Amino acid sequence: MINTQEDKLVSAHDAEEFHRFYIVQDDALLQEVNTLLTREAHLLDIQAYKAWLEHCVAPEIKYQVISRELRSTSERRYQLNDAVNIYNENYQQLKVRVEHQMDPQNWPNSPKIRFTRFVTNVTAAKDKSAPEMLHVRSNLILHRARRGNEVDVFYATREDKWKRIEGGGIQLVERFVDYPERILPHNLLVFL
Amino acid sequence: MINTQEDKLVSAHDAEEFHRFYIVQDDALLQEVNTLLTREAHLLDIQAYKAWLEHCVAPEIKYQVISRELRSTSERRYQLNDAVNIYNENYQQLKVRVEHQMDPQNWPNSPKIRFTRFVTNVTAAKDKSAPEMLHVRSNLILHRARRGNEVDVFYATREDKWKRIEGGGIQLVERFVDYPERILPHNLLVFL
Amino acid sequence: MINTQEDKLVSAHDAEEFHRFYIVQDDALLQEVNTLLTREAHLLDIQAYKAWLEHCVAPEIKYQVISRELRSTSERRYQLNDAVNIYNENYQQLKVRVEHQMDPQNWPNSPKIRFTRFVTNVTAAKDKSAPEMLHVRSNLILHRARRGNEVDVFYATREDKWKRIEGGGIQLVERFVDYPERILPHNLLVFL
Amino acid sequence: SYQNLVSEAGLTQKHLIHGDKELFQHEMKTIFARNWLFLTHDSLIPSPGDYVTAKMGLDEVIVSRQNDGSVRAFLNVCRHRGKTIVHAEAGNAKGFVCNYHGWGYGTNGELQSVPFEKELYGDAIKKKCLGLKEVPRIESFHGFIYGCFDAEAPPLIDYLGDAAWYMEPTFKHSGGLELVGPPGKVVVKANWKTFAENFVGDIYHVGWTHASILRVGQSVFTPLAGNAMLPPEGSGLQMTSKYGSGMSLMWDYYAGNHSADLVPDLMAFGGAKQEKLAKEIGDVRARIYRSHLNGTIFPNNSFLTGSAAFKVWNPIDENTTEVWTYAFVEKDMPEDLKRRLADAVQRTVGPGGYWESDDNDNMETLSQNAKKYQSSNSDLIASLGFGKDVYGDECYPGVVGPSGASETSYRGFYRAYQAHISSSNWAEFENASRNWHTELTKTT
Amino acid sequence: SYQNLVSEAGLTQKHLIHGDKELFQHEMKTIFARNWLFLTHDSLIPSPGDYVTAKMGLDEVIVSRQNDGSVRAFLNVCRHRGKTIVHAEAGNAKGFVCNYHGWGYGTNGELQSVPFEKELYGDAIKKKCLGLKEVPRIESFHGFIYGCFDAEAPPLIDYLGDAAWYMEPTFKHSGGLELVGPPGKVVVKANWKTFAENFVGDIYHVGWTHASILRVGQSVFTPLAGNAMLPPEGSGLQMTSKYGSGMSLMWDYYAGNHSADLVPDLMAFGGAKQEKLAKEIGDVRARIYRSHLNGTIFPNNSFLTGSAAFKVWNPIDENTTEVWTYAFVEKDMPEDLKRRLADAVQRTVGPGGYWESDDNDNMETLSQNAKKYQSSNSDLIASLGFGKDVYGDECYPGVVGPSGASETSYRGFYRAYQAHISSSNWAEFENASRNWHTELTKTT
Amino acid sequence: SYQNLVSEAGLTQKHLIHGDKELFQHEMKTIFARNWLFLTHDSLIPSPGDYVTAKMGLDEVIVSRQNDGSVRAFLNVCRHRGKTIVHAEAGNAKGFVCNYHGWGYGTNGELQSVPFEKELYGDAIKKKCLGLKEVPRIESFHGFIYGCFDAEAPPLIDYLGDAAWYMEPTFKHSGGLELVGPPGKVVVKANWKTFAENFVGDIYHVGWTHASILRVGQSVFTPLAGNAMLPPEGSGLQMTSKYGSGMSLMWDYYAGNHSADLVPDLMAFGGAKQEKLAKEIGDVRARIYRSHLNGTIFPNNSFLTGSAAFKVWNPIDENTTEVWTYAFVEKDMPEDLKRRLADAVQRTVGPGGYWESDDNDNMETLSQNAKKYQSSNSDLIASLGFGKDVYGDECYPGVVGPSGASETSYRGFYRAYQAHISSSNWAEFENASRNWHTELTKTT
Ligand code: FES
Ligand code: FES
Ligand code: FES
Ligand SMILES: [Fe+3]
Ligand SMILES: [Fe+3]
Ligand SMILES: [Fe+3]
């Protein structure tokens, strides 16, 4: 348990999230979320974007990837906005994106792009109020190679909300990613 | 479940493999395969090549790492071969290879080389016709450093067949890797 | 099982460790150690250093990160020391280190630094003599980005001893890391 | 030398200019030392003491709001041993301390406190000679603050030349814009001129490069997909300036590249205000307000009216640039419409922008090939629409061509580029530009 | 200057040539613009419309089969804004479209279709003046197609000089070879010359460097392990040409570098043909067929007969090259023996190849040390066998030395290298090589 | 040119010197080719045959203990095709074999065995003319071994000038030091001169840059936190020499930067020896022993007495250096105190060292800014304490200033640096340093 008055470097957000996990010790739930995150990462790797959107993405989805502005650690007066939304999509906006990738005149995707992604550090907890809801945290390395000698590697932590669907499925409701490099090393047209 | 007519970017191969997994929820099988892949990567990291070949590799092994040529996605006429075999080894070829590594006049291995392997995204399914067989998919980052300031990282997905043997062991029969960079960044004299 | 007479490239050390693991198949124990190591990497990622030191690190801690000097593989006469101690800390020394990080005039930490770390290849075994003890092996990629366009990535295997304490906790008593790049790529002011 | 890199009337240019490392060094002296450069907007440093850091070419400057309401900008380099002083992108500071030794500066650049002055420095130091290196020229255009390190420079409004006229409906008579921070920041491997050149008037590319998102997002630009049917005569124009800046005008496409989820409310609001404007400003200029401008203010600042994007292509090296991407909103838009449009600019031409990604394929290889032996002295052609350009139209402000799909601003740019590139000062640049409109119409 | 980097008769050379960056720039002018470079084989672009992409030094070209059966190659650069046109390594195309604005080109280099030509370009564009930059000279050698950017070049067969004679038993009289694609592609941090020189005639290294797989794989080369016992005089020879190309001949070693699983069948099959060849071509030349050549066709194409590898060392920068690795097979081999030998070439000198990795240790540090102050003007010695070299042998055509372990081709190579490096055109190189056989045979 | 990069009396220097790529190339010629450079210590190559590899600027040398007890050093490059010969950092060798073709060298640099000499080389190889390129000048200072590639260089002891005197209480009269391997090795993106200059006399930074570990580690240096109150003058001094080397002296701080776990025992031990030392060497010099020096032996070797760190800033390029970090211990310390101090130097100024980490922030941007257009011809000031230094104090030998918080050694350093940079040989440097002390005291 984290005391923010002593632990001077911890965010209020980072701390509130840490206190969700590592309490209840549910092995069942862990095997569930591993299947989920893996299947999702598998689908994005083989570029099965349609299936990802239909089966994995819940319709009420918020899909957010922010780039935070670098303030002084002592800042107490400057109050303009904190963060850009690199990604802040509802289902319709994601749908356009998926449809963009599959379109036969999408020049950057000829020859086919190779995506391989590594998912680690997974933990999950049931929301205490609405138990159908699932908080899940996971880390991700994404390797993106194309046209021979172009390569880009991405590193990200993803704070996820997943909800149980009536058909026995589970779909993604919320993804928040605080992308840790402020100047992104290449254009992030990939799903994290 | 993936429809290739709708999901325009998906391989015939990639779809047939995806349909093996994420159906059965066998936690016993998952811990078996985790122990397997971890032990195998442990053996290769400490360079215990002989042990890997005699304990982990089945004698009938096909060990394949291909480099696919970049075609247009609209290509419909050009039919020459698609792929080079960086690796396509039967047991004896692997034997020569491991024996090459252990040989005392193997100049590139002085000073001793450092291998670190990271294995994620492991899932598996029992083969339906021959239940002794195990389909196994795993992703791999391989870190290889030597001579102070020389370092190389490889990223790869490995499609594996493992067979259950005599004393309760399990050995590798088929390992296929479609290595995702077309121009390799440095020479891949390592087992993936 | 490794015969170091046949397996020419293996350390006696690397071999003595390999023989601890992958014999007993304790899924209970593995879930314990995963919860352990993830919780710890989470705390260090959100920079909750104080909690890491109080809750995760046992007071008797030896925390060692060495840089081994590059010798010939045939060396049999040169007997000077083998290794630098980048890290070789007891509780008090770590405490200063932690306290250095939290200090409000620690200029390198403004703007706040982003850490994300990926843990894979986890195995554990009970010490046979002292069952209170836990041998734990884990691999770690650590991503450290700051000030826009600065990034450094670290790769390492961590050989761990973890001890069960009476309050119901489990804490780290020994960390040994043989950091595999001899010339470090940037200053390693991070906990592995 | 560096003469004869772009031919007469700006018709061809040597491919080498998007790659040569020698010349990129010359540019830091002759392009980014000499000309006006975008720093920030009033909307992001409003209160006194507010500061941001901004690149002026390779140099990083600190831009600070003064107590008298002024704005001044100084190098983020120390006067002692030369450390970098401020490592935050934005904030509000009572002053700037450089934590190598503790030297203290005013938000106004003065060296205000040096530790142990009396003891160790004594007579050897005098703090009034050790102020930060100050940007000499700082002026403004309806909220957008621009710096220049050359003091002989023409005033900002003159430098903007005949392009100001087109910007005014959207930058002034709309009530004015605020800029929405923070910007998006990405590296793309391309010489900075390739984006400058794309944005100064590459409408030719929209129908083909962007054929996918037009079909799938149904921008108000879909009447161009496949480069099949250009919208008929009644399409638009393209325009260039004496001082390089130019733009392409596309009538009534207020929604620019945005996707159909926004297209209704954006065009609603912008037709609403168009009526109000025409009573105050007249028919032509009120339409320009609700039309779509894409343009580059020299050298490396681009905007998209209607699409509502503000880019700066910050140079890193001959084959890399750092791309900042802000949204601008009209101040009297409802807050929720501001929110939606702020996100939508990122979704389109940000780091994760599907328009800017398609676009980078062209920009990257464009400059990679510039490095190659057999292609570096090849001649790039900007002939599209050439000879249909005119000066002194009774109604339209600059040197004008009759489609937005033209390359008239291309030649404008590289005419000015070559003029700066071969000249030692502002004095000489003007002497190579007395006949600038004649040069660009020429034989016609 | 650039004179006096390789000494008289090529005996020494300044180490700096494997690292100096200015020089690499010169080489692109005087070496890769000037000389023949491997593009592809008929077997990989056979039908009309078939194309592959190939590097010619730094430049990338499209090499395309014409409908009339011909072959032509063009710069993979666009004539408009200079984008790259084709992003595939191979394919079959009815034409090449550049997806920036849509300009459409013929498989013949001609600009065939411009979007909106009538509307926007009108008289300012011609299309017949805007064909792709065509490589002026393309020629052939029993299927292997070589391109050149200098039209004043000597014909390919002449340029191959006294080297053609050794090549013909394997390239012509075997019935001919097909090349097996795709090639392997890898980066190694080493200057391209270090592989050129290794393959031009370094048999000296086999016994020491490759001592590891010699012991463990039982190549037919095992009689060299430890550099202990050379195969007696009756080992082989080495040869060099006026135009740089050279090789080392090792009698009867048809299989090795290949490992013992293949060694039986490769030697069986190749002895069989050797009888048949001897009836048609005679004893000596049929033996050459079943022997092992290692050689470099100037400047950067290397081969291994018998081992059956075809390399190209593609320059990237002074300390980097891109290494393409094909197998060649004799057309009348059985399908399974073709299959086996194609994989086995990769396993030995491919990306995952245990021969080429052992060899990279030598090549990398060889060129890293060239950059160092105290070693940059040091002299590398290619003195092995000097003075036992001879011209105009009654049997053996070129400039010939008496073991495969020689450095006769080394001096051959770097003599031609210096000749290009110091000369402005093909005419001047010819004037510096009038006396080329005299120079290398010298004193003895 | 390269004149006027450091102004008269070393008072200012152009910031460009920490970034310019041409200059770094010049430095390899006029600085690291010319001056003494740290190789290793007797304590690390003691037995005959023991060797280490060490950098001399860019060049890598092999440093070998001879059988007659001597020491010799050779380039780690081969005489044949130029491979690197030894790939170990340390070891003990019967000789050095280069595994390209098998050439064998003696521990004395002589070429001892060539495979197939009689067969293939015969008369073309002389053998005795093919020894490794040997370091001509190597000398020692109480165990510390230094090399130089210019033979006209002054002896090491003279080169050390008036600085040997301050060093001797710790290097000599302590009983002598052994160096503890292996060193730590890290890359930091900063030009080497930034560490040289930091260590020659930057005490000004200790109180501010290092404010955090002072508060938290309670070094004997804590009376400086916040740069609040200097220990009164009765603080220390700083000194510079004709041949560049300089240092800052801080009285009685024997346990330098170390944290409180060691501070008791280190100061106990070092005071004990201080008693004994005073009877042998006198009051002043025995105090110096138990005091703290921070200093740089020109051009790129730095030490910290008391804190017990021995650094070498190895150049890689204009904006990168490789930083080696050994501990030294006084030989008669207990084994456990040697253990503790060996780790604690790493804990402090090692790869994971919290002192050097804080400091790298200053060093990185210090040199990043040197590349920027508006900052490359800016002036760095070394004015702290200027005019308060004197020569020929008849107690304190060099050019001396009255606080360790001074920049007198800066100007000493940058005076010699400018002297080398503008002169072609040691002769010319001497003619520019005839009046070296006068220059530095001049106006007072
Ligand atoms: S450099 Fe700013 S503190 Fe001296
Ligand atoms: S550059 Fe090829 S289409 Fe314009
Ligand atoms: S290079 Fe040293 S053996 Fe030839
Ligand atoms: Fe576009
Ligand atoms: Fe070889
Ligand atoms: Fe310091």
Author numbering:
A (entry chain I), B (entry chain C), C (entry chain F): 1 to 192
D (entry chain G), E (entry chain A), F (entry chain D): 2 to 445
Sentences reproduced from the published study:
In this reaction, electrons originating from NADH/NADPH are transferred to FAD in the reductase, the first redox center which subsequently reduces the plant type [2Fe-2S] cluster in the reductase that, in turn, reduces the terminal oxygenase through a ferredoxin.
3NTDO-ODS2 is a mushroom shaped hetero hexamer (α3β3) protein with a cap and a stem composed of the α3 and β3 subunits, respectively. The completely conserved residues His206, His211 and Asp360 coordinate mononuclear iron. The tertiary and secondary structural elements as well as the essential residues in the electron transfer are conserved between 3NTDO-O and other known oxygenases. These results suggest that, for nitrite release from mononitrotoluenes both Ile204 and Asn258 are equally important and their role is the proper anchoring of the substrate in 3NTDO.
